[PDB]
Design a protein around this ligand. Structure first.
Ligand SMILES: OC[C@@H](O)[C@H](O)[C@@H](O)CO
Ligand SMILES: OC[C@@H](O)[C@H](O)[C@@H](O)CO
Ligand SMILES: OC[C@@H](O)[C@H](O)[C@@H](O)CO
Ligand SMILES: OC[C@@H](O)[C@H](O)[C@@H](O)CO
Ligand SMILES: [Mn+2]
Ligand SMILES: [Mn+2]
Ligand SMILES: [Mn+2]
Ligand SMILES: [Mn+2]
Ligand SMILES: [Mn+2]
Ligand SMILES: [Mn+2]
Ligand SMILES: [Mn+2]
Ligand SMILES: [Mn+2]
Lengths: 385, 385, 385, 385
């Protein structure tokens, strides 16, 4: 279960770099130099790193200081062979974003948020990023009167359309991935789930430029089934990127290492990504708990990749098992793949066996055999075969 | 606060007709004759009634018995002037639907579910229904292996496309409204939220035929902001119908009368529907608690319309108050309506005031004045002005 | 992983006997004869069975019919060596209990609830039950005015005190176990958690007669940590019985087979029961999903026992691993067991190393090493060591 | 609705003084001087203020600086007539407490936690505090192996017993109030609910010295019914203090102003405190949202007190209404207060009308009339009577 670059495991600078400051507590760790993170991550077998503008270049830096920061980072990439597959903008930390970036009530803040984004897009492309992530963490409200949501969606569409116009006029080979979250740090966040984000994208001027970047813990904060949501994104052809972590249900955003939280959902998720042949980064957006020192930081990070690899092996074994293949036929998963009425509407309407002469009682008596299947899946996950 | 037919208040036969059978308990009330419900509802000031096939015609009825049931009901409509604005199919009660209607693993069940739906569509149109609701209550799973979700979405799209082909080939003036629910009676239900349903509709062959029928308590079972979700549906032009009830957070589906549960969310919801000029039915999909006798049934039903009317008056007063108008300007809701960059991308890129010369500290120091606004909204809701 | 009688696995008659009626659906399975369940359960290697009075004796049976039902049951126990370690009363199904048993607003219903309970205590004692469970599933409210909770707690105390007096006056060797549940089928149920039940017991006339019967899925419906609550019950000396099943989050009460739902919590629960040396029944209060025929019913039951046995093995291997023992020392689990100030208050007050000369920064910098420890537990759970 | 000192409204220094740092954002407001808060709060009509040691005396101040801070504070209290009814210890902010105070795995940290607490008790007594609050916000875990909960409860008992010994040996008139919270900032916090805290107190050496300090939003984070939990605390004689604020569901800890969040629960809570005659402080532990400047801060604080006062009026009118009194009799609230069997066990056993001749069907048919009662409460709350 040794990770290698071929596994496409990526990490945000802000993940292993999180200092442990929470709503009730001061930082428990010193800041990590981005170049140190790059080197340590390369050693652990990571494919690449990702960043917010403000992770790499401290807010407010002069152009002189900005250029120095990028140069040191780029040297560390050159030395290690680490990739930068994705980047994103910090539109949530600075007090100016307290009511949003793209959907701030103040017009001047919205124009500022766009300019800050455009600037980092240029940098992302230059570094080789294929995906530009937007998490509108401050877009939303604590109170019902504070935000007219139809106007806010107009402003959100406007911002993303402008971003698409920018990218296409520059000739950039980069796509956008919108990251939904139901709440935190706002009471309610706009585009709260994968479904909301998918629906929103279809109203943009160029929908082909936009996908979703779903996060395990985000969807689980609404008590939603994360693999079901991923399946929908894949069904729509919009899974551009994914953020992997752990979450123990409906509560604050925990950002546990991948594999922690809902272990069975992690198993079904890996099963789905591997069998759908998802070929994007497996990005870990997580925080080593503030109880940990730096040794614990790197153990937590190693743990994320390790659990992914154990889960992949178990899922592959589950699908390869002919007893599982037999169980799947017994539960009629094969019949689910068959069209309901490839014979067409008229044939269906005239088919007496579909209704007039359908035996409802015989069909209702058929067991689904789902519990036996699920126990085979349990046995495999636990390696108790 | 007397309801009249002009208020467009509707009720399902299954609402006031619910006998009080829950997962742990037997029925506490005798069954209500549909004709008695129609007459009692007319007396309370209702605009109309809605039905599942199986509410009006008991499952399994011969064509002879079916025709008798429809005749008695139609006579009661003729006598009262009550409308039937909406109908729907029961694809969840009979054991044959234990694994779904449209996305059952068994192909024969899927064809049956389509034929049962088509038959009731004919009846709905004949009675004057404008909206046909689909709640896929059994579409989903308790276990991860039981349902390949991409295949299930293929089957769900296939069923709805066939329904659209049927309706258009008959020349019917009826639209479909898909009703999302996150869970219950399945562990997870397909198209769990308003967002998921909106995104799904955009992949149908004729998206113009399909909208959403969101329910207050459904969205609140995922801890989502129901008014935000409605605003999105309205923004997309897809709010075809709405189900109103009450829910006390994330737990089982409670179906309290409208106004109970989250009272402040009810206020914001009524504010939004009235100010967006929603002109569809205000349908109450609720259950009088099984503690109640028939007198309590009709009091609960009256209560639904009464709370809507009190909330409408309070919301109207809130918006009419020039002190509220002043508070809205102070929180820059007016600036939210202004385009971010009607000057265009190039002008934005060249605008030094948007970035190079933007004063971030002055803009960050501006208070949003949201708490004062929210207290004005509280004062109005409570009539403490 | 074969269960044998010495593993102390027990099942309610109502568990494998659930016909699959939910709030949205009719029964999918025919009724089981109690004697068939006993025999089938004995064949799977169960230790014993439990029952509500109404599972064994249909409601309102004459004394003559009552006798015939008990006779047939007793014979099946005689033939198999199956034990009856626990019994309980159904005070929730019949419409008369729609507002509660012990805490119904109507005094005549409360007396009847007590008499119905007392009758089944005699029977339970005769059959060999050591624990008498009480789940007050109807005690509570949907609305704030319906139940004065101080008065209701007086009535609840009164009922349990009367039951205590009854048992001690008969010289019965039977203890009560109160089963808490946050909600469903009432909007909120009284004594919603393990904590509320523990606190309540301390105010009864004979606290020594009463403990708790916590259920995995009940506490998880409040998003609480089930192993933590079980630890508190053990700490207090009050874990008289336990109900085991699975639950996926804060939602309706799912009753999945044990091991499904929150798998990691199930691991930590088995670890705790086994290391504390709990010696009571391992009772499965679950429902085979209504998708299943009878084969699926027995597959699901066997799965409960299998998952307990696998987790038991993995928890044992975890605790036995010298490398885990090393990690436990590294994380100072051993120091948690040493008294904070066995030297006393005066000694603590005079100890300068405790405050005045305490090096806060040196102690703050120590890593807890919790992540490495947790990954070892993960590796053991998955058999990846 | 003007608050005056006799209404007993109090505020923590940390509430109006919150600078607006959350997990995703920097501070949006400058620090408040404690003396400015005292004065501004006195002007709004507050009764008193509360503090953590670290709110008043910056962490690690010399004894000389400590004295100067207390002196300035005491003078502001002297100038205004502001009381200090409660005080508490910060055992959560400093990195040293990252694994807890009283239940840290490191014994030296636990001793330091006790000494830090004892120092502030002396100060609290000197200032006139009658209640000493303890919120064990760091006591808990993110992972199952990190904390043996039985040992942790031993350490928690040990600490509270030492504090009890200290207070009684000094002859102080001060009582402890334990503040439960389900999660945040730890994954799960020990003593997660009002119930767990009540139960724990019964195992302390001097139970009479300890009660609870429940918070609206804490219990609501577990989806529990806050007025029910407060009723249980009152029933037990343990409601020593209360924290009032608002919370919208199971999610992160929001700390909205009181009256926001679950409005109906706030009505039922005010009804309960006022009719039980609670005479302790009405303490607001809330945070003005970080969107607000200082004007918004004081608007939000005034809003807390205003909403309490409006709800108090509506609850009083509700109880005083003869029509509500009639509805309470119709619903048998008065019968709930009569003992179930003051005639005794033997009399109940011999009473044939209690079982043998009890007409279950006649009692089952009685409606509870709860819906009509609840609509009257709704009408009163909204001023629609
Ligand atoms: O909750 C935070 C979001 O998960 C993440 O994408 C990073 O924070 C991205 O900006
Ligand atoms: O949860 C049930 C759904 O709310 C309702 O639309 C009716 O039940 C429609 O079939
Ligand atoms: O839902 C019921 C509770 O889980 C247990 O009491 C058993 O079911 C016995 O009544
Ligand atoms: O979140 C903290 C708790 O709500 C209360 O203790 C106060 O904040 C005092 O510590
Ligand atoms: Mn993320
Ligand atoms: Mn994250
Ligand atoms: Mn509905
Ligand atoms: Mn409903
Ligand atoms: Mn139950
Ligand atoms: Mn149970
Ligand atoms: Mn708190
Ligand atoms: Mn508090």
């Amino acid at each position: 279960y040794q990770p290698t670059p071929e596994d496409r495991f990526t990490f945000g600078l802000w993940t292993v770099g999180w200092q442990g400051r929470d709503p009730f507590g001061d930082a428990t760790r010193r800041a990590l130099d981005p170049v140190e993170s790059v080197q340590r991550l390369a050693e652990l077998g990571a494919h690449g790193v990702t960043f917010h503008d403000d992770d790499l270049i401290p807010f407010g830096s002069s152009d002189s200081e900005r250029e120095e920061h990028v140069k040191r980072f780029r040297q560390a990439l050159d030395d290690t062979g680490m990739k930068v597959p994705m980047a994103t903008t910090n539109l949530f930390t600075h007090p100016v974003f307290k009511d949003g970036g793209f959907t701030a009530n103040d017009r001047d803040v919205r124009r500022y948020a766009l300019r800050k984004t455009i600037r980092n897009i240029d940098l992302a492309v230059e570094l080789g990023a294929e995906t530009y992530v937007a998490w509108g963490g401050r877009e939303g409200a604590e109170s019902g009167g504070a935000k007219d949501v139809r106007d806010a969606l107009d402003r959100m569409k406007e911002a993303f359309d402008l971003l698409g116009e920018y990218v296409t006029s520059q000739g950039y080979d980069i796509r956008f991935a919108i990251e939904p979250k139901p709440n935190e740090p706002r009471g309610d966040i706009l585009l709260p789930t994968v479904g909301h984000a998918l629906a929103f994208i279809e109203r943009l001027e160029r929908p082909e430029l936009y996908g979703v970047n779903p996060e395990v813990g985000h969807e689980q904060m609404a008590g939603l089934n994360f693999p079901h949501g991923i399946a929908q994104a894949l069904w729509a052809g919009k899974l551009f990127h994914i953020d992997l972590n752990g979450q123990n249900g409906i509560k604050y955003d925990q950002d546990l290492r991948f594999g922690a939280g809902d272990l069975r959902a992690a198993f079904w998720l890996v099963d789905l990504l591997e069998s759908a042949g998802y070929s994007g980064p497996r990005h870990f957006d997580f925080k080593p708990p503030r109880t940990e020192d730096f040794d614990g930081v790197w153990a937590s990070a190693a743990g994320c990749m390790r659990n992914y690899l154990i889960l992949k092996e178990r899922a592959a074994a589950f699908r390869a098992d002919p007893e599982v293949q037999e169980a799947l036929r017994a539960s009629r998963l094969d019949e689910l793949a068959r069209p309901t009425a490839a014979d067409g509407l008229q044939a269906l309407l005239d088919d007496r066996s579909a209704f007039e002469e359908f035996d409802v009682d015989a069909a209702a008596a058929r067991g689904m055999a789902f519990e036996r299947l699920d126990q085979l899946a349990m046995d495999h996950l636990l390696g108790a075969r």
